[PDB]
Amino acid sequence: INYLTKDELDIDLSQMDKKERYKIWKRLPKCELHCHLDVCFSVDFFLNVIRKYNIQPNMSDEEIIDYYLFSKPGKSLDEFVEKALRLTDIYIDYTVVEDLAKHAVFNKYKEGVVLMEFRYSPSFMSFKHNLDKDLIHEAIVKGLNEAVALLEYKIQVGLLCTGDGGLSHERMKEAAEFCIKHKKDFVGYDHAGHEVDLKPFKDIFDNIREEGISISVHAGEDVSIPNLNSLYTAINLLHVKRIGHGIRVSESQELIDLVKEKDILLEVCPISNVLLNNVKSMDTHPIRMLYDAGVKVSVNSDDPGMFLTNITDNYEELYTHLNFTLADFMKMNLWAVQKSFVDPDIKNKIISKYF
């Protein structure tokens, strides 16, 4: 892959067709911060697992897709999160998990990603077939390292723990303890699923930072919530370095100023927000006004295996419907690298290699 430099960003895209634009999108040196490894599979990988383990013998491929994935516009975040629970059928042994991780790296390299942060949920992957969380973790860390070494370190991978099991104090403590225990591999900690104001778990998140682990949580995504409290908590109480989505920052001048004052970056997932019905359309997506207001934002794919969309698709949508330029896209990837949780050298070397 012959990546675009900072000295090649004046390209005239107006005469290119969709196909030729995707070559440019691919060639952009991307840093992706918000993507769930759990569902980071191609359609063929997914159908290969469903067939190999004989999970849906009476369903056709089209039916398998309607039943497990989320490729069409839905109602809400809540609907997405509850539907996602059924494809946990695939997390059947530790080989499926290791392969998932390895292929995810390969797919991201081919899309032109150079610094990839993946996040996974131990509880998501473990509960269906009662798999051991540490054995999952082992499988995940082997797969990712397998792929990186095979690619001669042409893509670098960071790993984040999306902690869950539930919102009981015991479950959330356990989830944070799993991450802390594996902090040699986890560069950050997340909360996902149904959106929550995490104020009752400040004690746990303090602990995680005490242990040297950066926080990026999902907050300010779900537009059905009649307040912005999850955002205030993430910023003031959790001391997040980044926010997953955080698009509802756009609804408050006070929060716009707060995130800029703290140099917090918003992990924006354009297509996710459309499909999960958190913006009216891509035309009206808040990323535009947030970028224009000086908020640091990056571009991400979120759940590519469920959406049947990839990182470059999100770039296409931002170009076509919101008129982001190549220079804008390069700026955001520079921000994504700078605000990455991986080793500071890896960042600096990537920065001077491309940006």
Ligand X SMILES: O=c1[nH]cnc2c1ncn2[C@@H]1O[C@H](CO)[C@@H](O)[C@H]1O
CB of 91 to ligand X, least distance (A): 11
In the bound state with ligand HPA, the residue whose beta carbon lies nearer, of 192 and 326, is 192
Using CB under 6 A as the binding rule, whether residue 163 contacts ligand HPA is answered as: no
Of the two residues 218 and 331, which places its CB atom closer to ligand HPA in the complex?
218
Q: Which of 98, 174, 222, 303 binds ligand X (CB under 6 A)?
A: 303
Question: Interface with ligand X includes 164 (CB under 6 A)?
Answer: yes
Q: Is 37 annotated as a binding residue?
A: yes
Pick 1 or 85: Cβ nearer ligand HPA: 85
Mention every residue, 6+ apart, whose C-beta is less than 8 A from residue 141: 101, 159, 185
* Residue 36, annotated as binding a ligand: yes
| Residue 134 binds which entry of ligand HPA, Zn ion, ligand X, none, CB below 5-8 Å type-dependent | Zn ion
The answer to whether 191 is a known ligand-binding residue is no
Applying CB under 6 A, which of residues 303, 313, 316, 317 lies at the interface with ligand HPA? 303
CA angle 217, 271, 257 (to 5 degrees): 50
Q: Which lies closer to ligand HPA via its Cβ, residue 77 or residue 240?
A: 77
Site for ligand HPA, residues 170 to 199, rule: CB under 6 A: 192-193
- Residue 192 CB, shortest distance to Zn ion, in Å, is 5
In the numeric block, which tokens belong to residue 111?
A: 């899309």
Residue 84 or residue 144: which is nearer to ligand X going by CB? 84
Distances (CA, A) of 295 to 115, 197, 250, 258, 308: 21, 22, 9, 10, 28
Shortest CB 299 distance to ligand X, Å: 19
Q: Is 242 in the site for ligand HPA (CB under 6 A)?
A: no
Nearer to Zn ion among residue 269 and residue 332 (C-beta): 269
19-58: contacts with ligand HPA (CB under 6 A)? 36
Measured from the CB of residue 258, what is the shortest distance to ligand HPA in angstroms? 22
300 binds ligand X (CB under 6 A): no
Write down the least CB distance from residue 191 to ligand X, Å.
Answer: 5
> Considering beta carbons, is residue 221 or 329 the nearer one to ligand X?
221
Q: Is residue 81 a contact point for ligand X (CB under 6 A)?
A: yes
- The residue range among 121-129, 178-186, 255-263, 327-335 that interacts with ligand X, by the rule CB under 6 A, is 121-129
Tracing tokens 């995504």 back to the chain, one arrives at: 221
Both structure tokens of 18: 């969709």
Q: Does 39 bind ligand X (CB under 6 A)?
A: yes
Q: Which stretch binds ligand X (CB under 6 A): 190-198, 208-216, 240-248, 331-339?
A: 190-198
Label each residue of the chain as H, E or C: CCCCCCCCCCCCCCCCCHHHHHHHHHHCCEEECCEEHHHCCCHHHHHHHHHHCCCCCCCCHHHHHHHHCCCCCCCCHHHHHHHHHHHHHHCCCHHHHHHHHHHHHHHHHHCCEEEEEEEECHHHHHCCCCCCHHHHHHHHHHHHHHHHHHCCCCCEEEEEEECCCCCCHHHHHHHHHHHHHCCCCEEEEECCCCCCCCHHHHHHHHHHHHCCCEEEEEECCCCCCCCCHHHHHHHHHCCCCEEEECHHHHHCHHHHHHHHHCCCEEEECHHHHHHCCCCCCCCCCCHHHHHHCCCEEEECCECHHHHCCCHHHHHHHHHHHHCCCHHHHHHHHHHHHHCCCCCHHHHHHHHHHHC
- What residues are designated binding site? 34, 36-38, 164, 193, 218, 221, 245, 302
Interface with ligand X (CB under 6 A): 36, 38-39, 81, 84, 121, 123-124, 162-164, 191-193, 303, 306
